[PDB]
Each structure stands twice: as C-alpha cells, then as structure tokens.
C-alpha cells in the first residue's frame, strides 16, 4: 500500500488550492479514503472521509461550501478542492485508507498547505565556520513558505548531521544545519552545505571556507 | 461535538521502565452498532502517524506485543509494558464513532537517559553575510539532556535581550538527547560598533556557565 499526496504550496487568503492523492498497491474502489490534517501546534483534525464508490461523504462542519472531496476509480485517485482558504486552514494534509476496525490505517508522507499573503523568497545561504570533533553549519536565512531541505556533501555525511526547525519572523523563515567532522578531514578535505527550497525553484551549495 | 483529553501532556521515561496513557472522552463513544471505536496513534519526529491500536484494545498487525490498549465508556488506556527509544514521541488517542471525529491533543512521551552537558560552538557571520549589510551571529547547543536550558547574549559585557531567536530539535532517538539553536541578529553597522561577542548557556549538568566567546579582532 502506497499513498502519495501533492499539489500544496503557497496560495492567499479566499484562494483556491487543489490536492492529489494516487494509490496503489490494492483494489482502490473496495476502502474508503480520509484526509487529516495537522496544524503547526501539531494538532491533528479529521477533514473528511469517502466511501469506496464515491456516494457517501462525511466532512468537517466548518469546511462545508469550501471544500470539496472526490475520486477517480479508473485512475487511482482522491482529490480534494480548496476554495475560500483561511490562515486556520494552513497545514500539512494527509490522505489514508481505512480498513476493517480502524480509521486512518495506512497514511501518506502529507503535503504542506500555506495559507496566507507573504511573497515567496529563496532562501540566502551563507557558511558557518569557527579537539578531535569540529562543528560546522549553514544558515538558511529569509525565505518563505516551508520547507527547504539540507544536506552535507550532496548526502555523503548523514552521521552527525542536525537541521532545527525554523522560526518565523517578520514573514521570513530561517532556520540552521550543523554538522560534526573530525578536525583532522578539515579543511583538508570539503564541506559543503547543499540547500534546495521548491516553492522558488531555487539550488544553493555553499562550501565552508576556514575564516 | 465529542471531545478528547490526554494526561500527562509530556511523560518522562527511562529505557526498559513502564508508562500510561490516559485518554477521556467528553461523552461516551460507543457506536449505535456496538463498537468503541478508540484507536491509538503514534507519531514519531519527523514522520506520519502510525496506527497502534483499534478498537480500544486490538494491536494492529506489526505492532510489539508491548503496546496494550483498555478502558471503557469514557476512559481508555494506552499502555507500555517496556519502553525502547523508538517509541518515542507524540502518541494521540482518535474516535471514530460519531461525527465529527476527533483526536486528543497529543502526549510527549520523553526517553530519560543520563544527564548531558551541551557541547558549545558560536559563529561570527559569514564576509558574504556582510557584504549585503547583514550579520547574524549563530550558537549551537550540541546533545544535551535534560531539555530545559537557559542561553543568553553579551556583547562587550552585556545583556541583549532584543533580536534573539531560538529553536530547540526534538529529541533524538539515536541517543537521546536535545540541542538548541540560539541566533542574534544585526546590522553590519550595530555589529561592527562592538568587539566581544558571547553567548552563555546555564544547564543542571554543572553550577556555572559554559560560555563560548569571540573577538570581530
């Protein structure tokens, strides 16, 4: 059982927004389907749910005349359609499958809704740099909406890497990476700070250079 | 509109030792068919809820023999004979009997290992940060446990409360510990008007600070 969630991004208050799921891996016309969503506070909320043929449809009070919800059988396929978006409406949104005894038995990776009026900014990416350990970092600085990803050496160092989350403020997020190499490897050998942040289409790798 | 609660909000635990969930409905939960449809979910940092439990006490396919579901009525509990660091995270309780549904609002479950002193580092901006008219100056707070940590800034000697921010991770599984990210934010012009720069970290691994410091030379 496979679920995969897209469409979400950025839209402005009373916009409109369509969300994918596609499944696979089972009889999708035979289980009902549900969307839940969690918000920054990381409560999660049940939006709707759709039996197997499409007839029945139970949803959230307050996403009535706003929300739609349907499924393409032949084609493997749940949708929801946003319209009229409030800030309260922004979060990641999750599709899943239901299963006899149980509600949100198998759930997908999710996809990020943001609602709201900043203007989408790439990120600026800048070095961090300054025992046997030595701690480097990146910082990812005014950019907007989430995510953004990072990794060190093009994901050849994942053992003693961490990312923080990011802080909102002023409509820009920035957020910081730090990773821990022997001092011996550097700068002899590279460290280099890979940033990608989808919703500008925008690549960034950054060396780290000794001051 | 039915409601659910959940206690503790966070819950401290060592490796092996036991822990207890509870969740209370506002009323009951039992379906016109029968059923008590209270599941278990657990969200582990970093990735999508996970289904433990259904039907207030059946543990779904895959899912160790430690994990117990029981209660009855309006009042449930989520049981684990003997806690592995995986298991930690954000477990919520879920009805599914009447419309709308609902979930509790989650209960941190907290792995307790040997305290840990943070490993400091700080970072004077980058001459590309400069360039542009900026200078954010970065201290990261490196594994440490416990979670609570006091950071402060000095510049030349003294406090600055104003443009601070700061951002704690989860806590890791791997060990099991926490790190903090504390940022100060300045001009080029207000960062070129000091010298020292230092930020302090408070901790109960020790009575005095850890201070990390440098000159802008």
Redesign the interface.
Same mark, same amino acid.
Do not use: C, I, M, N
């Given at each position: 059982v496979k679920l995969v969630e897209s469409g979400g991004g950025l839209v402005k208050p009373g916009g409109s927004l369509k969300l994918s799921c596609a499944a696979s891996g089972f009889i999708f016309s035979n289980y009902a389907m549900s969307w839940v969503r969690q918000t920054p506070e =990381?409560?999660?909320?049940?939006v709707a %749910?759709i039996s197997g043929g499409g007839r029945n449809i &139970?949803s959230?009070?307050s996403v009535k005349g706003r929300f739609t919800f349907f499924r393409d059988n032949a084609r493997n396929t749940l949708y929801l359609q946003m319209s009229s978006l409030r800030s309260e409406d922004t979060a990641m949104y999750?599709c899943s499958r239901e299963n006899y $005894? *149980?509600? /949100? @038995?198998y759930?997908?990776? $999710?996809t990020l809704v943001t609602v709201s009026s900043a203007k989408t900014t790439p990120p *600026?990416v &800048? #070095?961090?740099? #300054?025992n046997s350990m030595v @701690?480097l970092?990146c910082?990812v =600085?005014g950019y907007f909406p989430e995510p953004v990803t990072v990794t060190w050496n093009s994901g050849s160092l994942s053992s003693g890497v961490?990312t /923080? #989350?990011?802080?909102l403020?002023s409509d820009l997020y @920035?957020? *910081?990476s *730090?990773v %821990?190499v022997p001092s011996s490897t550097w700068p002899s050998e590279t460290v280099t700070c890979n940033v990608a942040h989808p919703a500008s289409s925008t690549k960034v790798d950054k060396k780290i250079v000794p001051? | 509109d039915v409601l659910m609660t959940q206690t503790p909000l966070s819950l401290p635990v060592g490796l092996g030792d036991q822990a207890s969930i509870s969740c209370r409905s506002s009323q009951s939960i039992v379906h016109s068919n029968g059923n008590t449809y209270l599941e278990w979910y657990l969200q582990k940092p970093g990735q999508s809820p996970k289904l433990l439990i259904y039907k207030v006490s059946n543990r779904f396919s895959g899912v160790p023999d430690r994990f117990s579901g029981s209660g009855s009525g309006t009042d449930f509990t989520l049981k684990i004979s003997r806690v592995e660091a995986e298991d930690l995270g954000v477990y919520y309780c879920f009805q599914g009997s009447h419309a709308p549904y609902t979930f509790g609002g989650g209960t941190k479950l907290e792995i307790k290992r040997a305290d840990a002193a943070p490993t400091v580092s700080i970072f004077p901006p980058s001459s590309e940060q400069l360039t542009s008219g900026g200078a954010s100056v970065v201290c990261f707070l490196n594994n440490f446990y416990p979670k609570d940590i006091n950071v402060k800034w000095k510049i030349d000697g003294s406090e600055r409360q104003n443009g601070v921010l700061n951002s704690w991770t989860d806590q890791d599984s791997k060990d099991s510990t926490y790190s903090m990210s504390s940022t100060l934010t300045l001009t080029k012009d207000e960062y070129e008007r000091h010298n020292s720069y230092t930020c302090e970290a408070t901790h109960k691994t020790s009575t005095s600070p850890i201070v990390k410091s440098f000159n802008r030379n």
């Open positions: =990381k409560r999660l909320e049940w %749910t &139970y959230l009070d999750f $005894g *149980s509600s /949100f @038995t759930w997908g990776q $999710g *600026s &800048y #070095p961090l740099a #300054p @701690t970092g910082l =600085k961490h /923080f #989350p990011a802080v403020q @920035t957020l *910081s *730090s %821990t001051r | -």
